[PDB]
Amino acid sequence: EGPEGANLFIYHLPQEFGDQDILQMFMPFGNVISAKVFIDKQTNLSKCFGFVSYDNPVSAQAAIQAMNGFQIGMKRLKVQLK
DSSP: OOSTTOEEEEESOOTTOOHHHHHHHHGGGSOEEEEEEEEOTTTOOEEEEEEEEESSHHHHHHHHHHHTTOEETTEEOEEEEO
């Protein structure tokens, strides 16, 4: 985890997405220093939301503007500054 408002919560993820998936999807907006999908630790199933950290707040802002409302797997992502 890093800087500022450089941290994002992403909701309505495809349940099949893992850490690497979310990392690669958000790297186009800048240097991602950590990315995590949250899972139910009994079933190991994704909770369909996760966390992404950039090394700068402008990347996070760009990611929000581009990926909030973005449709993938018949859902629209909800991308939110933490």
